[PDB]
């Protein structure tokens, strides 16, 4: 039968019967109010649903009609700038025809609008008669000026085209193209439904290989990231999520607020309009280029766990567009509380902590679902997912499960330490916890545009680490057994620590720092490190001693220089001066160690 | 309108603690209410927990003592408990259940509201932004709080929070260059001490007639204290959203709500969370929290302040641990400085406040204060790890620097963080106490601050 | 592990019954 | 309902008790009928006393608000006429002047509360050598 009857509930759990035919995941209507549910147990005739809105006032006998679909979203024009619930719905919208602060719970507002025009351009490639198969671009949709939505055959759809909308204005219930295989006849609009728990196929998982500055020199430098970066960070999040926003090299962003606060909900929402890039010689709001899921704490368990997997499938739709999307998700933690809630009420055996055993193959299947990819389809391109999951402990504890499952999976982590954020040390990561396998991949890269960096970032961990060594001594020792390469090891890792490292994610002179500014700063610091190592050790056994303290008062305006390195405007003062100027303080390094060799 | 009549049902099946279990029960609603007439003559009213076929479970909220399988009648009303709301509620004590404990008559409604609320649209929500002067120097100093910010007090077990959220409660109101907050309170589960202090207080301060109190006793059946704070931020949003008030919700200790959600889902037989709380606890603490915040359209807004105290001062148990994943950050009374008698008792290391960054800044604020907050913060934790060397290693290891963070630190607890329970340090004057603490140290020490910044206030 | 024995006790008697409903 | 503690029956049957009461307290250091200061800042109450209710009927118009019915007043009122009464029954072998009684009570009234003043101390210490003698 089509529908059957509500048998029983417990919280946002529903037991139906008389659902004899309905397959496991397959979306349900419970209620005369016709609350989204989704199917999560048969037994007999009986379905156990799990709710994605609250169960109260459902009764027994009330309908439970079935649709013979999954989990899905609308994937197509009017997605950039959208701001949507877990589940898919429209929270502008939900507004507009609700004209009420609150979420009616019911709601059914259709997740891409049907009434805003669209301009497509059919593909000038296609006729009549022409094949196509899944991930072929049949039409560009111009819903941007920065982003040309590629209009794609979906997936496990293909045929020969027997009619194409000619160029002009089309609504996303028009149906702009038509297709045949096997005498079945096919039509399709500008939009596509697409399951969230479903991978989008690809014609090839490519290898990572090409940076993704977040701006942050501590990570760009230290624990890089790649187009496709599998990638987790401590929830501690709003600068990472800000600065990839601005002026990540991803063409399109998405947020994943999971069981965001309501009020950092209201400020990534409020802000994010306002925020803007300066990109193709022009100001534009970032937008123009983003698109956001949002779930306050209080929506129901299952719109949490919803919102993670819609949340990646629109960055896999993106994907296939050839386009290389950032995603961020506000806490991965509370994604696994919302699995160990779920668990819970479905009566299933826990685990550690309470979790379902089965949490490392769920955070599994959100991570690995990131990465460089050659499309499906025709134009061959490139696109690719990058995923920054946060994963804030109950106390900043990394053995925490959640932090456990998630670091067995993730290529990148960004362990950032109370004892740098108490101390207000910005951004706040530990560089000697933190890692990044990508690195291997990275060097080609590297080795091609930036061959003093290598070099660079393994004298910088180098210097970081005997920091660590030195730093612990003095505790016991003070100064008194420390050689004088100790001492501008230490000084060295002071200036790599306070004046590299460290960056102010608030103030525009340290807001963002591209790669030029990056690596020139380090060249400096570990050239200074080189030379005045140079200019002790040279003396060993000598008639007279080149000290630590000989070369930091004769160096004392180079070490002001190296400093203030930092202060260069990115926006004022461009990569071809700051170059220049750097350039001009090795000059000057190299002259001032001179006078004492 | 529910014109329709009321079933009466003897059928209860079973009686397990605080849970009757109804069967032959024609068409159950999930959360609706009933109503038990007892053999004694007496009414217990109920909500239904679990829905199935004939069957329907209710967890009664005046406990079920005197319950009898065969002679209690149990009335079910076809409808969610949707309580009674009126701005008259200001100026009156009711009990945990929502009927009046002072003298005066049962509420007169404005309207029926479901105590659960209704999820407010992401996209209506106005972030908070107008920072609040509690008085309190660590609340409006190295943290802050904010109009619509739902900012919580943790405790260690038997500190004075009570007299802090009482101070907030006298002293709070904006920062000056109508403006009262209607507080809501709800005691969940207090001593009749903590209930006579703040009723008493309410009284004195001569507020009472902006006020709403809710009173669930520690004498009081355990179940009525899970509704205790749904009606108080009902009546929050009724206040708020509908009657434009500024509203200020007090949530007297959360870890004696979270008991009353643990001893139902016991005897429920329901799959433990970790502790033995509910699984679900995050989702049912935020149905709480999230009740907060400035909305579109209205002047209104509601602030909260809930209360929060630690079994044995554990920052990592459930009811602390799931809080702060919600909550905008928590502010932590601390049994070492309450030993010490500093009162407040506030240690601002692990106290952090969300907001901070946004509701500090030039024109909302003094422009120096968020810097300020920020550097004393890190003197505090560098006072702190000194102080511990102080012992380790003697205190005649220490170098100047480390005695300048150790003789920072105790003018620090004795002049910024002790106030007394009747001062009300404006911010601007809390900020003046700040830089003669910043001024221990030679200026190059003060690395969190700019040097345009220093060059202004730390030669003062 | 005792919770958990006691929650998996209550699912095997639960399951037992409804096999026996069925009769 | 509900009120420090009592149910609504409880509440109403305590205030039918301190109406009862006070009469009986006024009755005793009054059975002259000439402390006339004293019984008109009762006569409120009194009424439902002195004239021949039932039991159930005061109770009736204690629910229905033609009594008093707040019970914390009549609890204070009470506190007066009973530690007045205190004085009067501990002193009985020299009976005082009426016109000190009055005096007496006038202060009593005017004490902010009277249950902690020295008066209070001074009645325990009275009954103890009474009781013991």
């Given at each position: 039968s089509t529908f059957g009857y509500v048998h029983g509930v417990s919280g946002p759990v529903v037991t139906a019967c008389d659902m004899a035919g309905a397959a496991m995941y397959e979306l349900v209507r419970v209620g005369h109010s016709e609350l989204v549910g989704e199917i999560i147990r048969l037994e007999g005739d009986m379905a156990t649903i799990q709710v994605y809105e609250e169960t109260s006032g459902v009764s027994v006998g009330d309908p439970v009609l079935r649709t013979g679909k999954p989990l899905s979203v609308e994937l197509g024009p009017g997605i950039m700038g959208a701001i949507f619930d877990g589940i898919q719905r429209p929270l502008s919208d939900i507004s507009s025809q609700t004209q009420s602060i609150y979420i009616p719970r019911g709601?059914?507002?259709?997740?891409?609008?049907?009434?805003?025009?669209?301009?497509?351009?059919?593909?000038?490639?296609?006729?009549?008669?022409?094949?196509?198969?899944?991930?072929?671009?049949?039409?560009?949709?111009?819903?941007?000026?920065?982003?040309?939505?590629?209009?794609?055959?979906?997936?496990?759809?293909?045929?020969?085209?027997?009619?194409?909308?000619?160029?002009?204005?089309?609504?996303?219930?028009?149906?702009?193209?038509?297709?045949?295989?096997?005498?079945?006849?096919?039509?399709?609009?500008?939009?596509?439904?697409?399951?969230?728990?479903?991978?989008?196929?690809?014609?090839?998982?490519?290898?990572?290989?090409?940076?993704?500055?977040?701006?942050?020199?501590?990570?760009?430098?230290?624990?890089?990231?790649?187009?496709?970066?599998?990638?987790?960070?401590?929830?501690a999040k709003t600068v990472i999520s800000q600065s990839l926003s601005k002026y990540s090299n991803s063409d399109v962003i998405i947020y994943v607020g999971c069981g965001e606060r309501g009020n950092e909900m209201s400020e990534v929402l409020r802000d994010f309009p306002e925020l803007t890039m300066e990109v193709d010689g022009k100001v534009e709001s970032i937008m123009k280029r983003t698109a956001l899921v949002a779930n306050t704490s209080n929506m129901p368990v299952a719109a949490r766990e919803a919102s993670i997997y819609t949340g990646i499938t629109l960055s896999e739709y993106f994907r296939?567009?050839?386009?290389?999307?950032?995603?961020?998700?506000?806490?991965?933690?509370?994604?696994?509380?919302?699995?160990?809630?779920?668990?819970?009420?479905?009566?299933?055996?826990?685990?550690?902590?309470?979790?379902?055993?089965?949490?490392?193959?769920?955070?599994?299947?959100?991570?690995?679902?990131?990465?460089?990819?050659?499309?499906?389809?025709?134009?061959?391109?490139?696109?690719?997912?990058?995923?920054?999951?946060?994963?804030?402990?109950?106390?900043?504890?990394?053995?925490?499960?959640?932090?456990?499952?998630?670091?067995?999976?993730?290529?990148?982590?960004?362990?950032?330490?109370?004892?740098?954020?108490?101390?207000?040390?910005?951004?706040?990561?530990?560089?000697?916890?933190?890692?990044?396998?990508?690195?291997?991949?990275?060097?080609?890269?590297?080795?091609?545009?930036?061959?003093?960096?290598?070099?660079?970032?393994?004298?910088?961990?180098?210097?970081?680490?005997?920091?660590?060594?030195?730093?612990?001594?003095?505790?016991?020792?003070?100064?008194?057994?420390?050689?004088?390469?100790?001492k501008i090891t230490l000084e060295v890792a002071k200036l790599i620590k306070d004046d590299f490292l460290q960056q102010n994610g608030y103030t525009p002179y340290d807001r963002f720092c591209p790669f030029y500014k990056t690596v020139g700063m380090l060249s400096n610091m570990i050239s200074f490190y080189d030379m005045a190592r140079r200019a002790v050790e040279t003396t060993a056994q000598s008639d007279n001693k080149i000290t630590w303290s000989i070369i930091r008062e004769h160096m004392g305006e180079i070490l002001y220089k190296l400093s203030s390195m930092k202060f260069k405007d990115p926006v004022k003062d461009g990569e071809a001066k700051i170059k220049a100027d750097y350039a001009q303080l090795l000059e000057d390094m190299q002259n001032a160690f001179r006078s004492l060799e | 309108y529910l014109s329709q009549p009321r079933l009466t049902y003897k059928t209860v099946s079973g009686v397990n603690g605080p849970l009757v279990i109804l069967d032959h029960v024609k068409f159950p609603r999930y959360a609706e209410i009933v109503h038990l007439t007892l053999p004694d003559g007496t009414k217990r009213s109920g909500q239904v927990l679990e829905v199935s076929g004939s069957k329907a479970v209710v967890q009664v909220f005046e406990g079920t003592s005197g319950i009898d399988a065969k002679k209690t009648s149990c009335e079910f009303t076809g409808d969610i408990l949707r309580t009674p709301v009126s701005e008259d509620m200001l100026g009156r004590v009711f009990n945990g259940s929502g009927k009046p404990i002072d003298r005066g008559p049962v509420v007169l409604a404005e309207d029926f509201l479901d105590i659960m609320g209704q999820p407010i649209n992401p996209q209506?929500?106005?972030?908070?932004?107008?920072?609040?002067?509690?008085?309190?120097?660590?609340?409006?100093?190295?943290?802050?709080?904010?109009?619509?910010?739902?900012?919580?007090?943790?405790?260690?077990?038997?500190?004075?929070?009570?007299?802090?959220?009482?101070?907030?409660?006298?002293?709070?109101?904006?920062?000056?260059?109508?403006?009262?907050?209607?507080?809501?309170?709800?005691?969940?589960?207090?001593?009749?001490?903590?209930?006579?202090?703040?009723?008493?207080?309410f009284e004195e301060n001569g507020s009472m007639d902006n006020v709403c109190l809710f009173l669930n006793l520690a004498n009081d059946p355990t179940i009525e204290r899970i509704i205790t704070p749904r009606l108080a931020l009902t009546t929050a949003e009724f206040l708020a959203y509908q009657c434009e008030k500024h509203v200020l919700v007090i949530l007297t200790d959360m870890s004696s709500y979270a008991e009353a959600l643990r001893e139902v889902s016991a005897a429920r037989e329901e799959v433990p969370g970790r502790r033995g709380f509910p699984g679900y606890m995050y989702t049912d603490l935020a149905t709480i929290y999230e009740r907060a915040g400035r909305v579109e359209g209205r002047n209104g807004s509601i602030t909260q302040i809930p209360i929060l105290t630690m079994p044995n001062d554990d920052i990592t148990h459930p009811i602390p641990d799931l809080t702060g994943y919600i909550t905008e950050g928590q502010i932590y009374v601390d049994r070492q400085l309450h030993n010490r008698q500093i009162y407040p008792p506030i240690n601002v290391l692990p106290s952090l406040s969300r907001l901070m960054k946004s509701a500090i800044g030039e024109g909302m604020t003094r422009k120096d204060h968020a810097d300020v907050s920020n550097q004393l913060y890190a003197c505090y934790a560098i006072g702190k790890d000194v102080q511990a060397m102080k012992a380790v290693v003697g205190e005649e290891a220490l170098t100047s620097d480390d005695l300048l963070y150790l003789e920072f630190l105790q003018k620090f607890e004795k002049n910024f963080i002790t106030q007394g329970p009747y001062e009300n340090r404006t911010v601007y004057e809390t900020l003046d106490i700040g830089w003669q603490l910043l001024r221990i140290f030679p200026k190059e020490m003060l690395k969190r601050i700019p040097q345009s910044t220093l060059s202004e206030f730390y030669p003062r | 592990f005792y919770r958990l024995k006691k929650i998996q006790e209550k699912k095997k008697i639960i399951k037992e019954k409804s096999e026996k409903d069925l009769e | 309902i509900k009120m420090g503690?009592?149910?609504?029956?409880?509440?109403?049957?305590?205030?039918?008790?301190?109406?009862?009461?006070?009469?009986?307290?006024?009755?005793?250091?009054?059975?002259?009928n000439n402390l006339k200061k004293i019984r008109e800042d009762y006569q409120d109450v009194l009424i439902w006393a002195e004239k021949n209710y039932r039991f159930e009927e005061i109770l009736e118009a204690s629910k229905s608000g033609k009594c008093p019915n707040d019970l914390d007043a009549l609890s204070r009122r009470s506190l007066i006429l009973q530690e007045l009464l205190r004085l009067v029954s501990s002193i009985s072998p020299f009976k005082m002047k009426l016109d000190l009684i009055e005096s007496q009570y006038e202060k009593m009234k005017q004490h902010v509360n009277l249950w902690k003043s020295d008066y209070h101390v001074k009645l325990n210490q009275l009954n103890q050598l009474t009781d013991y003698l």
């Amino acid at each position: 039968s089509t529908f059957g009857y509500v048998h029983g509930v417990s919280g946002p759990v529903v037991t139906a019967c008389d659902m004899a035919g309905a397959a496991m995941y397959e979306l349900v209507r419970v209620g005369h109010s016709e609350l989204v549910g989704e199917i999560i147990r048969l037994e007999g005739d009986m379905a156990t649903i799990q709710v994605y809105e609250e169960t109260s006032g459902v009764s027994v006998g009330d309908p439970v009609l079935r649709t013979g679909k999954p989990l899905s979203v609308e994937l197509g024009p009017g997605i950039m700038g959208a701001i949507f619930d877990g589940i898919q719905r429209p929270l502008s919208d939900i507004s507009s025809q609700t004209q009420s602060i609150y979420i009616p719970r019911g709601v059914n507002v259709s997740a891409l609008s049907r009434d805003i025009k669209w301009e497509f351009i059919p593909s000038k490639n296609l006729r009549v008669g022409s094949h196509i198969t899944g991930g072929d671009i049949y039409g560009i949709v111009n819903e941007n000026s920065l982003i040309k939505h590629k209009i794609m055959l979906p997936p496990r759809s293909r045929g020969s085209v027997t009619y194409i909308a000619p160029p002009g204005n089309y609504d996303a219930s028009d149906v702009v193209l038509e297709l045949e295989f096997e005498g079945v006849k096919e039509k399709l609009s500008m939009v596509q439904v697409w399951p969230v728990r479903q991978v989008r196929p690809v014609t090839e998982k490519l290898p990572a290989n090409h940076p993704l500055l977040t701006g942050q020199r501590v990570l760009d430098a230290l624990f890089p990231c790649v187009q496709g970066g599998t990638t987790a960070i401590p929830g501690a999040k709003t600068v990472i999520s800000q600065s990839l926003s601005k002026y990540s090299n991803s063409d399109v962003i998405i947020y994943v607020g999971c069981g965001e606060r309501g009020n950092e909900m209201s400020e990534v929402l409020r802000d994010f309009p306002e925020l803007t890039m300066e990109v193709d010689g022009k100001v534009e709001s970032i937008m123009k280029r983003t698109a956001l899921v949002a779930n306050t704490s209080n929506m129901p368990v299952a719109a949490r766990e919803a919102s993670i997997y819609t949340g990646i499938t629109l960055s896999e739709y993106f994907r296939d567009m050839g386009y290389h999307v950032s995603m961020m998700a506000d806490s991965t933690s509370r994604w696994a509380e919302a699995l160990r809630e779920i668990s819970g009420r479905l009566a299933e055996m826990p685990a550690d902590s309470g979790y379902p055993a089965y949490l490392g193959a769920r955070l599994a299947s959100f991570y690995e679902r990131a990465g460089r990819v050659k499309c499906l389809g025709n134009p061959e391109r490139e696109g690719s997912v990058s995923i920054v999951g946060a994963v804030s402990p109950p106390g900043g504890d990394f053995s925490d499960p959640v932090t456990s499952a998630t670091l067995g999976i993730v290529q990148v982590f960004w362990g950032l330490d109370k004892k740098l954020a108490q101390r207000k040390h910005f951004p706040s990561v530990n560089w000697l916890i933190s890692y990044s396998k990508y690195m291997r991949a990275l060097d080609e890269y590297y080795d091609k545009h930036f061959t003093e960096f290598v070099p660079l970032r393994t004298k910088a961990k180098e210097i970081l680490q005997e920091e660590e060594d030195l730093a612990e001594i003095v505790q016991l020792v003070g100064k008194a057994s420390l050689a004088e390469t100790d001492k501008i090891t230490l000084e060295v890792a002071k200036l790599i620590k306070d004046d590299f490292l460290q960056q102010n994610g608030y103030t525009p002179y340290d807001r963002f720092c591209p790669f030029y500014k990056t690596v020139g700063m380090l060249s400096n610091m570990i050239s200074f490190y080189d030379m005045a190592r140079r200019a002790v050790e040279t003396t060993a056994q000598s008639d007279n001693k080149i000290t630590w303290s000989i070369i930091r008062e004769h160096m004392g305006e180079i070490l002001y220089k190296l400093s203030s390195m930092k202060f260069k405007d990115p926006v004022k003062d461009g990569e071809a001066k700051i170059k220049a100027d750097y350039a001009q303080l090795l000059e000057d390094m190299q002259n001032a160690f001179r006078s004492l060799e | 309108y529910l014109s329709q009549p009321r079933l009466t049902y003897k059928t209860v099946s079973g009686v397990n603690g605080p849970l009757v279990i109804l069967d032959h029960v024609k068409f159950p609603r999930y959360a609706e209410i009933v109503h038990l007439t007892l053999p004694d003559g007496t009414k217990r009213s109920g909500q239904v927990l679990e829905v199935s076929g004939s069957k329907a479970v209710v967890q009664v909220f005046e406990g079920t003592s005197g319950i009898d399988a065969k002679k209690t009648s149990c009335e079910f009303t076809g409808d969610i408990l949707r309580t009674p709301v009126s701005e008259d509620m200001l100026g009156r004590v009711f009990n945990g259940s929502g009927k009046p404990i002072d003298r005066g008559p049962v509420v007169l409604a404005e309207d029926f509201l479901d105590i659960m609320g209704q999820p407010i649209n992401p996209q209506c929500r106005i972030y908070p932004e107008e920072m609040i002067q509690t008085g309190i120097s660590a609340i409006d100093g190295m943290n802050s709080i904010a109009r619509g910010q739902k900012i919580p007090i943790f405790s260690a077990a038997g500190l004075p929070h009570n007299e802090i959220a009482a101070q907030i409660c006298r002293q709070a109101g904006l920062v000056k260059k109508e403006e009262n907050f209607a507080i809501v309170f709800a005691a969940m589960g207090v001593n009749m001490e903590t209930a006579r202090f703040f009723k008493s207080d309410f009284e004195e301060n001569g507020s009472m007639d902006n006020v709403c109190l809710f009173l669930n006793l520690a004498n009081d059946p355990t179940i009525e204290r899970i509704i205790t704070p749904r009606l108080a931020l009902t009546t929050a949003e009724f206040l708020a959203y509908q009657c434009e008030k500024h509203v200020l919700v007090i949530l007297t200790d959360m870890s004696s709500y979270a008991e009353a959600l643990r001893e139902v889902s016991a005897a429920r037989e329901e799959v433990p969370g970790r502790r033995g709380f509910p699984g679900y606890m995050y989702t049912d603490l935020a149905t709480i929290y999230e009740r907060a915040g400035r909305v579109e359209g209205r002047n209104g807004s509601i602030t909260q302040i809930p209360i929060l105290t630690m079994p044995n001062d554990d920052i990592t148990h459930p009811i602390p641990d799931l809080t702060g994943y919600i909550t905008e950050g928590q502010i932590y009374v601390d049994r070492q400085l309450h030993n010490r008698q500093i009162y407040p008792p506030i240690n601002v290391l692990p106290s952090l406040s969300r907001l901070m960054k946004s509701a500090i800044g030039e024109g909302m604020t003094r422009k120096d204060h968020a810097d300020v907050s920020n550097q004393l913060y890190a003197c505090y934790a560098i006072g702190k790890d000194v102080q511990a060397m102080k012992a380790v290693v003697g205190e005649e290891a220490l170098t100047s620097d480390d005695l300048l963070y150790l003789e920072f630190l105790q003018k620090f607890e004795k002049n910024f963080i002790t106030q007394g329970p009747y001062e009300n340090r404006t911010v601007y004057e809390t900020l003046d106490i700040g830089w003669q603490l910043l001024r221990i140290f030679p200026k190059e020490m003060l690395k969190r601050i700019p040097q345009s910044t220093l060059s202004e206030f730390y030669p003062r | 592990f005792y919770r958990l024995k006691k929650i998996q006790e209550k699912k095997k008697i639960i399951k037992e019954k409804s096999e026996k409903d069925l009769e | 309902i509900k009120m420090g503690g009592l149910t609504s029956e409880q509440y109403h049957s305590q205030v039918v008790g301190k109406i009862g009461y006070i009469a009986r307290c006024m009755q005793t250091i009054d059975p002259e009928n000439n402390l006339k200061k004293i019984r008109e800042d009762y006569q409120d109450v009194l009424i439902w006393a002195e004239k021949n209710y039932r039991f159930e009927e005061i109770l009736e118009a204690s629910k229905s608000g033609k009594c008093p019915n707040d019970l914390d007043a009549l609890s204070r009122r009470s506190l007066i006429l009973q530690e007045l009464l205190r004085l009067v029954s501990s002193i009985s072998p020299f009976k005082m002047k009426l016109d000190l009684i009055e005096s007496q009570y006038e202060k009593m009234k005017q004490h902010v509360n009277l249950w902690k003043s020295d008066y209070h101390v001074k009645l325990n210490q009275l009954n103890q050598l009474t009781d013991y003698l």
